[PDB]
Design a protein around this ligand. Structure first.
Ligand SMILES: [Zn+2]
Ligand SMILES: [Zn+2]
Ligand SMILES: [Zn+2]
Ligand SMILES: [Zn+2]
Ligand SMILES: [Zn+2]
Ligand SMILES: [Zn+2]
Ligand SMILES: [Zn+2]
Lengths: 284, 284, 284, 284, 284, 284, 284
C-alpha cells in the first residue's frame, strides 16, 4: 500500500491519505474513479478531485508505452469453476450428450475401459475472462473469412493436463505431434473416444492409484469445448501435417471402412477452442 | 460454497470470506448486489465494494457468450400450484363454467362415461415464470398480426399428460397426430367433451384402478387454459394438416348436423396455450 | 400449507420450513414481508432473505398477467356489521331521520300498513372494502363530470333483498323493471315510502309468517344509503327509461298535485349507491 | 396565464418572473418540475427551488379536495387519429376482415344497399387516453368477475353518430330502447350487417346529398371496436332488456332457423367498448 | 400527415406548426425527439419542449395497450439487398462453396439439369431487421435448451418462392408436405441438390419461358441460409413427421446406400432459419 | 449499386434520390454521414436527416450479427507500394543494410550465384492496413507475455512467393516444412542468405528466363520485414518442430563450428511478421 | 493561495474568492478549467466565466516566453514505483530472465560473489512522465534514421547510483570514463555481469554494513532497462571512445576467445535508455 502513497505525495495531496487508508483505496482502484466516485468517498473539494484525475491521466495515458494499466490490473484475473445443479436443464443436456455418445471401440477397453455408461459426479462451467476474449477474437477473425460463419461446434477432449488447459488455455505448443493428422489439438464427437486419452495417450499407465487403465474406482475428467472449425479440410487417410492446409482453419477425419472408426476433428491453433465444461465422472 | 470462494480469492479479498459465510452469500446472490447491499452486510471499505462490483461486472458482461448468469440463478424456476378457496368468487366462476358447459354426446358415454354433474374437489392456479413469459411473447407476436387483437379464449383441455404439461408446458412435438384436424393440440368449449380424453383417446383404458371408463370413485383432471387463436380458420369437414393454413394462427371446427356435435379449437404451436387452472373432480 | 412449501422448496430453502410452520407463515403472508419482517421471525442470513424476496418479486410482478396476487388476497374480504350504541349521537340521528320522515300515504296502509311511528330494534354500520372502493371510484368519475360535485345524499331503500345487497352491493341487473321511472333502483327521502317495498312490490303477500302487510309482530329491514346523484334530471310524469337521460346521472321524480305524493330518486347504475346503515324495526 | 404570476408573487419570488416568461413556464408546467428541472432553466439558489417546490406541494396535495391538478391538466386531452398506411400489415388485415365478412341478408339490400365488396378510402387508429383508461378499468373489473378472462372481441359498429363516439366514447344513455334486445349498444362480426345502420335505423333516408340508401358515391363510416363481453348470455329470440341478465356482462343473439340470420352482440355499459379503428369506405 | 397537426393542436401549441412543417417533422419523428433535438430544431422555450415530451409520454406510454408506436414506425421496415463486390473475400468464399459442392445424383440430371459448375452473376446479402430479430430470439431459445449451443449451420435452399421468402421469411405454414421427412423446410449440404428445387418439386415443368428443366438461358436463384439446428435428430429412412421429434429441434437425413444419396436437414419452425445470401446463377 | 435506392425507398424518402444520384452517394458512404454531412449535400429538413440516420442505425447496429458494415466497406482496402527516392535517408540506410551484410558462404555461389554486392533498382514501402492491424495485435499479445518487450527486429526474407506475401501477408500454412528447424517462416540477418532463396529452395532451377541461378540480368526481389521474436529460444543444431517450444515465441539458430555458418531466425505464427520494405536488385 | 487571489483580484472578480477557497482552486487548477468546469463549481454568470478564461489566455499564451505554464503545474512530476505481484506473469518473466541469464565468470566472485542463483525480494515498475517523454523522443529520432527501426532491447544495468538514476534518469555526464569502450553507459545481456557492478566498479568496498564483497546477507539492486541501440557498431577490442562512432548510435562488444567473455552494449547519450524495472535481491 505504497504506490498510492507515492502517487498522492507527488501531487501534494498527502493530507488526503487518511481517507484513502480507511476506504482501502489502492492505486488500481484510484485509476478507475471519477468525480462521482471521489465525491462519494469524501473528496469534497473540486480542486483535489481535479488533481487526482489529471494525475491518473498523466500516469495511464501519458505513459502508455510502459503499460502501467496492465501492471495494476492483475487482480481479479484467473479461472472460476461454477457447479451446475443436477436438477437444471443444462446439467441434463451435458449429461445426455455424454451418455448418448458412447460407442463400441476397436480395443476391448484397453485404452479407455470396459463400460457402457458413466456415473457423472459433477459438471463445472469454466469462466475465464482473458481466455474467452482470446477465443472470441480468433472466432471473429475466422468468421470475417468464410462468409461470416464461424462453424462453431461443441466437442470432447481428453488429456492428463486438463488443469493446465483450464488455467492457461489450449496451446498448440503442447500439440500431439504423434497424432494421425499431425501436430494439432484433437477433439472427438464421442465421449467414449476422448475417454481413451484421459490418463494418457492410449491410456498410458492408467489411473495413478492402481495403474489400471480400466479402473472403476478413480475419478476422471473430460473437457466439453467450443471449437471454431471455420472452413474444415476433409481427410480420410492419415497425413502428418504441421498446420491446416492453405485456405482452411481445421481438419476433419471422417470414419472409413479401412480408416477411422469414429469422427475426429483437429485444430492447429490453441486459441480456436475454449473448454466450457469440466466433467467429473466414473466409468461403469 | 466454493465458487464464491474462488471469486473472492481471485480478487485478493479472501479475508472477507468469514462475512460471506455468515450471511450465506453465494455467487448467484452476490451478482445481484450493489453498494447499498454490500454496505448492509458489512463491507464498509469503498475499495472492497468497488473490487467486488467490478469483478461481478467482468464475470457477467465480459463473458456474456458463456451465459454465466443463466448458469447462476436457476433457483426459483419451476411450477407452483395455488389452491383456490371454494368460497372465492373465482372458484365459483370456474366451477360454473365446468358445470354449465355439460352437454349430451352422440355416444351414450362410451368414452366420457355417464353423468350430468361433476363433484369438484379442488381448483388450482398454475404459476410458472418461464412458461408464462413464453406464452406472452407468442401472444404479442400473434397480436402484432391480426390487427392488435390476440383473440384469446378460455378453453378446456384433457389429456393423460397434464402433469407433464403443467411443468414443461404445451408441446406440439407430442401432438395428437391422429386427430380429426391433424397434428395439433385440441381444446373445447364444453368440459364434457374434454372429459372424454382424460384417460386417453376415446377414454383409453379407463381409470388405472378399475380399468373402467365410467368409474365414479377415482379422480379426474382437466386443464382450463388461455388459448390464443388469432386469425382463426373455419372448418366443418375433417382434414389432416401439420401446421396452420397460410395466414391463420389456429383452426376452429364448428358444429354441424352431419359433422361435429360440438365446437373444437386446434393450435399447432404449443406456445399459444397456457394452463391457468388445474381442476380435480369426479363424475356423478 | 402446501403452496408455501412448494415455493420455498423451489428456492432450495426447505431447511427454513420449520420456521414457517411455527410462525404460521402462508404464501399470502410471505408475499408481504421484507428484510425487517423476515429478520423478526428468525431468518438471519442476508442471502436467505434476499432469495425469498426475489422469489416473491418474480411471482407477483413477474407474472402479473396471471394475477396470483388476487388469488392469494381473497381472505379478509367480505362484509362486517358494526352495531351502533343506542346512546350514541349516530344512532340517534339515524332514528330521528326514520321517525321524522314518516307520512300518511294515499292507501290506508295497504302496502306499508297502518302506523305513526316505528320501534327501532337495532341499527348497524355496513362495512365492505371492495364495495366501498367501487362506490368511491364511481363517485370520483361522476364528480369529474358535474363540476367537481358529486351531489351525494343519504336516502332510504326498502327491498326484500337487503341481505343480498349488503353482501354483493346494489345491482341494476335486478332492477325494478316495472317501476314508474323504468329499470332503475329507487330511493326515497321518506322512510314510510320505502316501507311500502320491504315485503315486496306493493307490499307483496305481507310478512312470510302471517301473510299480513300490516304485521306488527314480524321484523322489517330498511337500508340507509349514500347515493351519488350527480346531475339529476327533473321529471314529473312516468317514463319507463332504461338508463339516465343524456347528460345526466340520475332521475328525480318530483311531487305533483296529479302525480307523486312524495319525491323519488332513481339511479340506473348500481355502483352509485353504498348501503351504509342497516335498520331493523317494527311498525306500531 | 396569470396564475403563474400570482403563484410566484405570493411566494415573494416575483424577481424570478422574467425567467418563467422567457421559458414559457405556466403553472401546469411548474407543478411538474423539481430541483433538476428548476436548475436547468436557471433557478440556481437552493432556497428558491425549495420555496417553489413547497408552494407546489401545498397547492396540489394541500388542497386535493379542490382538484386543482385536474383543472390544470385540462390541456392536452383529446382524440387524435393516426392514419394507417395501405402498405402496412395492420391496414391490410383490417381491410381483409372488412371485406371477407360480407354476406347476403334477409332483405334484398334494402337497408345496406346492393353490393359484394367495399372500396376502402381510409383507416385511422383512434387514440384518446381518458377513454382508454375508462375501458381498461372496466376490463379489469369484468375479468376479476369472470375468472380472469375478459372475453374481449373485435367487432364492427355502424351508426350515424361516429364522430360523437370517437370524441366522447360509447354511451348507453343514447341506446335505442327499440332494439331487438332492448336498450343496448349493438356490435356485429359481419361488416355488411353493421353497414345497415350507418345512415340510421333501417338505412334511414340514404346519403345526406342524394338521399339514396344504396349510394355508390357518398362515403360511409364504420368503427372496429374492442368489446369486453365477460360472461355472455346466450339468447335465440327477441326480448327487451334494460341491462344484462343477472350474473352476465353482455348478451349474444345467435342465428336460428326461426330467428336471426347473423349474430349480434349487445353491451349495456358504454365503458365496455373502445372504438379502435375508424374505417371510411364506399360501397361497390 | 394530419396526425401531427391534431397532436400539436390538442396541446395548444399550434403556433409551432410553421417550424414542424418547415423541418418536415411527422408524428413518428416527434415521438423520438427529446429536449436536445427539440432545442436543435428551434423550440427554444423550455415550457414548450416540456409539454411536447409529456404529450408524447401520454400517447406512447399512457396508451400502450393500443400500441400506437407500432402503427408509427411502419416506415423503414422491409428487406434490402446489398450487392457483394466480386473482388471481396465474401463473394469468393460463397462462390467457392457453391462450386465445390456440385455432385452427381441418382437421376440422370433430370430434375436439376446437366451441368458441372455454375456461372454466378450476383450475390446479395439480404437484410431485414424484424426477420433477423425473430431468428435471433429463436436461436437464443434453442441454445438455452441445448447446453448453450445453437448448432448454427450454413445450408442451401431451393424453391420457386424465394422472392416471397426474402420478404416474409421462412414460414412452416408453406411446408413441403410431400417431403421425405414430413411437413418441414428442407436444406441441403450440397448446392447441386438445392438446385433440383428452384423450379418446383422435381423441377416442375422447368423454367417458365422454355419449359426446359435443364435450361442454360434463364437466371436461377438459390438461398444460402443460417439454420439453427439445435439438437438434431438423426434418421436414415423415410418417416413423415409434422413436427420435430420430442426433445429435438430439427431432423438430419443421413445418406445411405439404399437411402439418401446426400445429406438433408429439416426444420419444422419457420423462425429457425434466415436467408443470408441470394445467389443468381446459370448452370453450365 | 441499387442498395441506396432500396434503402431510401423503404423510408419513404424517394424524392431525395435525385440528390443522392447527383452527389453519387452510395450506401457504404451513407452509413458514414451524420447530420453535418447530410446538411452539406442539401438534406435541409431535420426530419429527413433523422429518418436517414435512424435507418442507418437500424441497418448497422440493429443487424450487427449479419455484419453488413464489413460487407459495405470493401472500398479503401488492399496493399499499395510507395517508392523511396534514392536521395532519401531511409533509402540509403536500407541500401546500407542490404550491401553491408553480404558474407562468405560454404557453397561455391551455387545457390545465390557469384557476386560481391548489389545494384539496387528500387525500394518500396508496403502499406496494407488489415495486415498491419493483424501484426500489431499479435505484437501486443507477445509483448504482454514477455514483460512488455516485443523484441522486434528487421530481417531479410526471400521466396518465390513475394508477390503473394505482399498482398495476403505471411502465413504459416505455406511454411517451409523441409527446413532445418521445422515448419516455420525463416529470416536471416544477412541479405545474401535470403538472396539464395529468391528463385526457390537452393535456387530452384534458376531464373525463369534462362534457368541460370547466377543470372545478372533478371530482376530479383527480397523482403525486409519487421519480425517480433519475443522470448526467443536459443538453438544450435538441426531439429523438426511444428510449433514454437513451450513458453517461447520464436527460435534462433546460432552459428556454430558444426552447424550454421550464419544466424537464422524462425517464427511459427504468420501474423508475427510484416513485410515493410520490398527491395528490387541485381547481383554483381 | 495568494497567486490565485492576485489573479482574480486583477480581473475585478474578488467576490468569487469564497467559491475558489472552498473548492481548493489554485492557479494551476484554474488554468485548466473551461466553461463547463467553471459552471460545475458555481460560476453561473457567463461574463464571469468569460473573464476568467480570457485572463487565463492572456497569462498562459500571451506570455508564453516566460513559460508560466511550466512554473505552474510542477506538482505531480516525479517518479513512482509500482510493486509487481509474484503471481503475475510480468513478475515471473522478469525473474525468469534474471535467474536464467546467470553465467560462470572468470573471477571467483571477487567483484561479484560465489553464487549460482538469486533470491528475488521484489520487483517494481518505474514510472516517470518526463523521463518517458525524453526516452520516446530520442527513440523517435533514432528511428527516423536507421530505416524506422529503433533496435530497442531490454538489458541489465548495475550501479551504486541506481537511486539517482530512477529519479533523474541515465546521464552520460556521470559516465564510466575508465570503461573498456570509453566514456559510455554500459549494459549487459546477462544479469550476473551487471551484478558485478552493484557495490562499485570491481565490487568497490563491498556492502557498507560489512565492507564485504559477495555478502550473502545484504540486499542488492539492479535495473532492467529499455535501451535504444539503433545502428550498433560491432567490436572485439577496447577503443576508449568518447562518443558513438560516425553513422552509428551505439557500440557492442561481442564475445571473443581472447577478449570479452560475454556480450556487452554501450550507449553515449543518457536519453537513449529508460529504467523500466527495479529489482531488489539477495544472493544464494
Ligand atoms: Zn484407480
Ligand atoms: Zn377407478
Ligand atoms: Zn307476521
Ligand atoms: Zn350520395
Ligand atoms: Zn429457360
Ligand atoms: Zn536470367
Ligand atoms: Zn553485508
Amino acid at each position: 500500500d505504497f504506490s498510492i502513497t507515492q502517487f498522492v505525495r507527488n501531487l501534494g495531496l498527502e493530507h488526503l491519505m487518511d481517507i484513502f487508508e480507511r476506504e482501502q483505496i489502492t492505486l488500481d482502484v484510484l485509476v478507475e474513479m471519477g468525480h462521482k466516485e471521489l465525491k462519494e468517498i469524501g473528496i469534497n473539494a473540486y480542486g483535489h478531485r481535479h488533481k487526482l484525475i489529471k494525475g491518473v491521466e498523466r500516469l495511464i495515458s501519458g505513459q502508455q508505452g510502459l503499460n502501467p494499466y496492465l501492471t495494476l490490473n492483475t487482480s481479479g484475473s484467473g479461472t472460476i469453476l461454477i457447479d451446475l445443479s443436477p436438477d437444471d436443464k443444462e446439467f441434463q443436456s451435458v449429461e445426455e450428450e455424454m451418455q448418448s455418445t458412447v460407442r463400441e471401440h476397436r480395443d476391448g477397453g484397453h485404452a479407455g475401459g470396459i463400460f457402457n455408461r458413466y456415473n457423472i459426479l459433477k459438471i463445472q462451467k469454466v469462466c475465464n475472462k482473458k481466455l474467452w476474449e482470446r477465443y472470441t477474437h480468433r472466432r471473429k477473425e475466422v468468421s470475417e473469412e468464410n462468409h461470416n460463419h464461424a462453424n462453431e461446434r461443441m466437442l470432447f477432449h481428453g488429456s492428463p493436463f486438463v488443469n493446465a488447459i483450464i488455467h492457461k488455455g489450449f496451446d498448440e505448443r503442447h500439440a500431439y505431434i504423434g497424432g494421425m493428422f499431425g501436430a494439432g489439438i484433437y477433439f472427438a464427437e464421442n465421449s467414449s473416444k476422448s475417454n481413451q486419452y484421459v490418463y494418457g495417450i492410449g491410456g498410458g499407465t492408467g489411473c495413478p492409484v492402481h495403474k489400471d487403465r480400466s479402473c472403476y474406482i478413480c475419478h476422471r475428467q473430460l473437457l466439453f469445448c467450443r471449437v471454431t472449425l471455420g472452413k474444415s479440410f476433409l481427410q480420410f487417410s492419415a497425413m502428418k501435417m504441421a498446420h491446416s492446409p492453405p485456405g482452411h482453419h481445421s481438419v476433419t477425419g471422417r470414419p472409413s471402412v479401412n480408416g477411422l472408426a469414429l469422427a475426429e476433428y483437429v485444430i492447429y491453433r490453441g486459441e480456436q477452442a475454449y473448454p466450457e465444461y469440466l466433467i467429473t465422472y466414473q466409468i461403469m
